[PDB]
């Protein structure tokens, strides 16, 4: 395979292409009208459009994908996940056309559609449940190996939210038994490729097979961290006709890995997906043990036509407890501004006394649902000091960039010092903390420090701004206590992202910026009235039409409410600046 | 240990914090008046002042370091080297307060203060 067409979008499209580039394989993608400026379009060497935004017209189409493969001279097609990945007719169409299908052959796909058929084929081959998934990888030469199983039990609305790579809570004998059983299952159905055999267990390790997946799944990067393998490379090699490069006796098991899936959704209403722009996107620090897979760039929008997922964060550490600490440490560095997400839920889900102990089963979240969605808490006075300082320094920044464009450079007045003559300057600002207003009196000190009195308590507040790449950080010292938080100010809302949480403080909007009865324009006769008493109009509504020296004037409503009286009936003469209707 | 207080300064404070960040552990430091703009203040997630520049008023103090650990909600204290690193009374104070002392227990520290005591204990072991 010198060129592969990836009939998919977003995170999975980029994950495969990065491997392809690493190997030297050219990548082609498709993007509909919807993904014209998505991540995988620029990562690909070439990409083709297809049609309208809904997936039925673009990614689920059988003929359009083949047509792209033929004109680009692709040698293989990778379906990824979710569109044609289980489409047996497409795999058969590729074979007949002459294109390599990267995945199991049609004979292995079709017999897996019916649950009773695979149950018999595999059977002939030998209270708090958990879902445990063990991987099988086979080739066209009769070989198969197993990779270590995952714990996929934590879910809500039958959607996986987090995943644990090494399946904690079992013994090495269980791991060996699941390996052999899944290989016998994969051979029983003559499976080739990267697949997954799903077992259900009780509390006493009585594993039973339920279902098998026949595609290279999105879950795999969490296992790669602990096995040290590259399954995308492996899948391409056996598709070209090669053998499994690494035998079942060479597969290791080191440490624990976790995935946390970040969705565009609002948990406050029992998770309905939301779609909107992302104004700020920042990822945790890169590290060989912290694998960051995103499908959304800053400036991109979440659509309604496709999966609302934004990113997957995968971490690795030496043991289970270290990985849970790293997962939460890095997850709090992931900052999304512009829409509501499930990040706070993920933090409360992982940082739960029962989850850290290991009390994991398929009903964990509905059992403890009330303990995961928590209400907003009031800001501390120190957090209000940080918000006030960030606002003051942002105003300074605006002053500094004005000065850089001035002729009168180096001059005084440019330093936002608040230096009054013989007296001090105190600025009275109000910040809105949730629903409540708090007044902060900020005194400008001669040495550049601030003394901020919030209600009665005075804080000695110092700090400045600094940049790291494309992000702005606020460096604070409040009463000798140093701290650092990312400072993002978007329209009215001050975002402070720290290692202890995220606080949103709103700037109140004055009345004269948020305000945006009627009179007669000239002395004319009224043609048509519209409304009477008891009606209700909303702003920008037709109340009356009047003709004044042959010029039709339609009155409108700047005001709002309900009309109490209409003073002029239709056909009467109204004069200049005479009131027409009234609001009581 | 999800958060550690490092009761030290300079090279050793930065050496430990770099590991902590690598592991995912939050770091708190102290800086007196003397180290307000030193390296470990900016590397830490949070740091507290204590008092006058001489070490007797800042890093050798037993109560000030515990007070910082309690208000920052630190789970463990790392003494590093040179200040409280051999202070057996501090290790005992941490135990009584409920804070993990990162180091040997007081029972292993106290018996090593007297050179003749450790000589006999080890000699009897071969």
């Amino acid at each position: 395979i010198t060129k592969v067409l990836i009939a998919n979008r977003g995170e999975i499209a980029c994950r495969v292409m990065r491997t392809a580039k690493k190997l030297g394989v050219q990548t082609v993608a498709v993007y509909s009208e919807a993904d014209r400026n998505s991540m995988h379009v620029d990562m690909a060497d070439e990409a083709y459009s297809i049609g309208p935004a809904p997936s039925q017209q673009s990614y689920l189409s059988m003929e359009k994908i083949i047509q792209v493969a033929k004109t680009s001279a692709a040698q293989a097609i990778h379906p990824g996940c979710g569109f044609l990945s289980e489409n047996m007719e497409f795999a058969e169409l590729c074979k007949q056309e002459g294109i390599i299908f990267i995945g199991p052959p049609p004979s292995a796909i079709r017999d897996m559609g019916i649950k009773s058929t695979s149950k018999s084929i595999m059977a002939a081959a030998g209270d708090t449940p958990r879902h445990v998934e063990v991987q099988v990888f086979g080739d066209h030469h009769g070989n198969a190996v197993y990779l270590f199983e995952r714990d996929c039990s934590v879910q809500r609305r039958h959607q996986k939210i987090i995943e644990e790579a090494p399946a904690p809570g079992i013994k090495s004998e269980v791991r060996k038994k699941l390996g052999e059983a899944a290989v016998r299952a994969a051979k029983a159905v003559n499976y080739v490729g990267a697949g997954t055999v799903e077992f259900i267990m009780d509390s006493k390790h009585n594993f039973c097979f339920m279902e098998m997946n026949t595609r290279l799944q999105v879950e795999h990067p969490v296992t790669e961290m602990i096995t040290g393998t590259d399954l995308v490379e492996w899948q391409l090699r056996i598709a070209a006709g090669e053998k499994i490069p690494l035998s079942q006796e060479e597969i290791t098991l080191q440490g624990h890995a976790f995935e946390a899936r970040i969705y565009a959704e609002d948990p406050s209403n029992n998770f309905m997906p939301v779609a909107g722009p992302l104004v700020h996107l920042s990822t945790p620090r890169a590290d060989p043990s912290t694998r960051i897979e995103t499908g959304v760039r800053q400036g991109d929008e979440v659509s309604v036509h496709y999966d609302p997922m934004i990113a997957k964060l995968v971490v690795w550490a030496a043991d289970r407890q270290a990985a849970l600490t790293k997962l939460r440490y890095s997850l709090r560095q992931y900052n999304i501004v512009g829409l509501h997400t499930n990040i706070d839920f993920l933090l409360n889900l992982s940082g739960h006394p029962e989850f850290e102990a290991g009390n994991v089963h398929t009903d964990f979240i509905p059992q403890h649902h009330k303990q995961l969605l928590l209400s907003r808490k009031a800001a501390a006075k120190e957090s209000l000091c940080q918000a006030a300082l960030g606002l003051i320094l942002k105003e300074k920044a605006m002053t500094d960039t004005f000065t850089l464009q001035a002729h009168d450079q180096f001059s005084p007045f440019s330093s936002s010092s608040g230096r009054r003559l013989n007296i001090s300057y105190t600025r009275n600002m109000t910040l809105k903390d949730g629903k409540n207003n708090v007044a902060i009196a900020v005194t400008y000190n001669h040495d550049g420090s601030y003394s901020m009195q919030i209600e009665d308590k005075t804080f000695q507040v110092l700090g400045n701004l600094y940049s790291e790449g494309d992000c702005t950080y606020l460096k604070c010292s409040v009463n000798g206590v140093a701290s650092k938080a990312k400072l993002i100010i978007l329209e009215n809302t001050i975002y402070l992202f720290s290692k202890e949480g995220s606080i949103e403080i709103d700037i109140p909007v004055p009345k004269y910026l948020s305000s945006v009865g009627p009179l007669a324009p000239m002395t004319g006769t009224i043609e048509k009235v519209f409304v009477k008493a008891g009606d209700k109009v909303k702003a920008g509504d037709s109340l009356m039409v009047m003709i004044a020296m042959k010029m039709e004037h339609t009155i409108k409503s700047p005001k709002d409410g309900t009309v109490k009286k209409v003073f002029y009936r239709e056909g009467a003469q109204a004069n200049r600046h005479t009131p027409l209707v009234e609001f009581e």
Side-chain angles (χ1 to χ4, degrees), chain A:
Chain A
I1 302 168
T2 63
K3 182 182 287 186
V4 60
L5 172 67
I6 302 165
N8 215 303
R9 63 187 295 280
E11 295 81 1
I12 196 168
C14 291
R15 175 67 182 85
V16 173
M17 289 191 286
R18 287 196 297 271
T19 299
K21 288 182 181 295
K22 180 174 72 174
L23 300 174
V25 177
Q26 295 182 35
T27 62
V28 180
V30 298
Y31 59 90
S32 189
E33 70 182 355
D35 291 316
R36 174 64 182 83
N37 294 301
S38 182
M39 189 182 290
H40 62 276
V41 172
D42 291 338
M43 188 176 289
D45 295 292
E46 276 147 6
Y48 297 73
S49 67
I50 299 172
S55 65
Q56 294 88 344
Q57 300 299 307
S58 63
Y59 294 96
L60 296 171
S61 175
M62 292 170 68
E63 295 80 2
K64 293 291 187 181
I65 298 300
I66 297 299
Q67 186 64 52
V68 170
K70 287 181 176 179
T71 191
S72 67
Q75 292 178 358
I77 296 167
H78 180 74
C81 297
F83 295 123
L84 299 171
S85 67
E86 297 181 325
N87 186 311
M88 74 183 182
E89 295 83 359
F90 186 75
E92 179 64 22
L93 179 60
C94 292
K95 181 178 178 180
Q96 289 178 27
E97 293 296 350
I99 301 165
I100 295 168
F101 181 77
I102 299 166
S107 66
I109 298 166
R110 68 188 183 183
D111 288 340
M112 300 301 289
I114 299 167
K115 313 277 206 160
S116 68
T117 298
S118 67
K119 177 171 175 171
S120 293
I121 292 167
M122 291 180 183
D127 291 316
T128 60
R130 300 174 71 191
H131 296 293
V132 176
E133 295 183 358
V134 56
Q135 295 180 181
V136 295
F137 185 75
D139 64 29
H140 292 288
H141 298 264
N143 299 304
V145 301
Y146 63 89
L147 281 81
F148 288 98
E149 61 272 18
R150 305 182 293 270
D151 178 14
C152 301
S153 298
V154 182
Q155 58 81 35
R156 84 287 187 277
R157 300 182 66 195
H158 303 289
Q159 181 175 37
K160 297 175 183 176
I161 185 67
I162 65 171
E163 184 175 27
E164 298 190 51
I170 64 172
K171 305 297 185 183
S172 66
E173 291 298 320
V174 173
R175 291 181 179 92
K176 288 189 286 186
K177 288 179 181 179
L178 289 171
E180 291 180 20
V183 169
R184 286 193 292 272
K187 288 181 178 179
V189 301
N190 196 31
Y191 184 79
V192 178
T196 301
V197 181
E198 229 180 352
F199 289 88
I200 186 165
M201 63 174 284
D202 67 7
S203 66
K204 300 295 184 181
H205 298 137
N206 291 305
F207 291 77
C208 300
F209 171 72
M210 291 179 72
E211 77 171 85
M212 178 177 179
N213 296 328
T214 57
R215 64 181 183 271
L216 182 73
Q217 296 182 216
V218 299
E219 286 82 0
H220 291 306
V222 85
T223 296
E224 291 178 331
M225 291 302 293
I226 60 169
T227 60
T229 64
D230 183 328
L231 292 173
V232 174
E233 177 177 355
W234 288 14
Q235 186 69 55
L236 289 168
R237 286 181 180 276
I238 62 168
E242 298 182 21
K243 295 179 180 179
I244 298 171
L246 188 142
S247 69
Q248 69 269 31
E249 295 179 355
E250 296 180 298
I251 300 168
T252 192
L253 179 63
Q254 297 180 33
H256 293 238
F258 290 68
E259 181 177 89
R261 296 183 180 181
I262 302 167
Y263 295 98
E265 66 185 3
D266 186 335
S268 71
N269 64 9
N270 198 32
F271 309 99
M272 301 296 106
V274 300
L278 276 74
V279 175
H280 181 92
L281 189 150
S282 177
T283 64
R285 71 182 180 85
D287 190 290
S289 66
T290 300
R291 180 171 291 171
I292 304 164
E293 295 180 353
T294 64
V296 181
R297 298 175 291 183
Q298 186 176 282
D300 289 342
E301 297 181 355
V302 176
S303 179
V304 299
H305 296 290
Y306 300 95
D307 192 292
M309 189 177 76
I310 298 168
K312 297 183 276 91
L313 175 64
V314 177
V315 302
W316 179 92
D319 62 16
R320 185 173 184 272
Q321 294 300 332
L324 289 171
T325 299
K326 186 181 288 187
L327 179 62
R328 291 175 67 194
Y329 177 80
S330 293
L331 181 58
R332 286 185 176 177
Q333 293 180 0
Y334 192 83
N335 301 150
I336 300 295
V337 179
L339 75 161
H340 294 172
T341 67
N342 66 318
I343 293 167
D344 55 356
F345 181 77
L346 289 166
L347 289 167
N348 289 337
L349 178 61
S350 180
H352 190 284
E354 291 296 297
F355 184 75
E356 289 178 352
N359 190 8
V360 177
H361 57 92
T362 61
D363 294 316
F364 181 82
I365 290 168
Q367 182 177 37
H368 301 290
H369 185 72
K370 69 182 182 181
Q371 297 179 335
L372 301 177
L373 301 180
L374 306 177
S375 67
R376 187 183 182 277
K377 304 296 185 182
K381 288 183 171 67
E382 294 81 1
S383 295
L384 293 171
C385 290
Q386 294 177 34
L389 181 63
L391 180 60
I392 292 166
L393 291 167
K394 181 67 174 179
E395 290 173 353
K396 179 179 182 292
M398 289 192 285
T399 299
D400 289 343
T401 60
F402 180 78
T403 300
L404 292 172
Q405 300 299 307
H407 186 72
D408 188 21
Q409 298 182 5
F410 307 104
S411 67
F413 292 101
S414 68
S415 175
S416 298
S417 64
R419 285 283 293 107
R420 300 287 185 271
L421 179 64
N422 297 326
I423 61 171
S424 64
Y425 167 51
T426 299
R427 178 177 177 182
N428 294 305
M429 64 178 69
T430 300
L431 298 173
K432 185 176 181 180
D433 180 19
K435 296 181 180 178
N436 295 329
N437 292 306
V438 180
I440 303 98
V442 181
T443 299
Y444 284 67
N445 294 327
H446 292 77
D447 62 1
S449 70
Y450 305 90
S451 296
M452 301 187 181
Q453 184 176 38
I454 303 172
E455 293 179 353
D456 60 0
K457 183 173 177 177
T458 299
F459 300 78
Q460 303 300 308
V461 179
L462 292 91
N464 214 330
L465 302 176
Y466 66 92
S467 297
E468 295 181 352
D470 58 338
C471 296
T472 299
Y473 293 89
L474 173 64
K475 184 179 180 181
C476 296
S477 177
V478 180
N479 294 332
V481 180
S483 66
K484 175 181 313 156
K486 190 179 290 185
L487 176 64
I488 300 168
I489 302 171
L490 175 60
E491 293 179 354
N492 297 284
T493 301
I494 301 167
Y495 296 89
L496 303 171
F497 294 98
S498 73
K499 289 323 175 27
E500 296 181 354
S502 177
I503 299 170
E504 298 182 21
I505 304 296
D506 291 316
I507 301 166
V509 178
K511 290 179 180 178
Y512 58 83
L513 299 179
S514 61
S515 67
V516 179
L519 277 304
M522 267 85 78
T523 79
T525 82
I526 304 184
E527 284 171 357
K528 323 157 173 180
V529 302
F530 277 70
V531 307
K532 297 302 178 308
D535 287 312
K536 44 155 61 186
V537 306
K538 295 295 180 70
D541 206 304
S542 173
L543 304 183
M544 216 91 81
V545 57
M546 182 208 64
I547 175 161
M549 299 179 172
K550 308 173 219 95
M551 196 64 51
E552 300 149 9
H553 284 122
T554 297
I555 324 291
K556 272 177 291 286
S557 304
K559 66 165 189 59
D560 214 317
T562 50
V563 182
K564 72 101 175 177
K565 189 196 183 314
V566 175
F567 210 82
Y568 271 109
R569 53 173 314 278
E570 50 270 48
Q573 197 95 25
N575 278 331
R576 184 88 211 244
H577 288 324
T578 299
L580 266 69
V581 292
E582 288 101 4
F583 166 74
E584 77 183 27

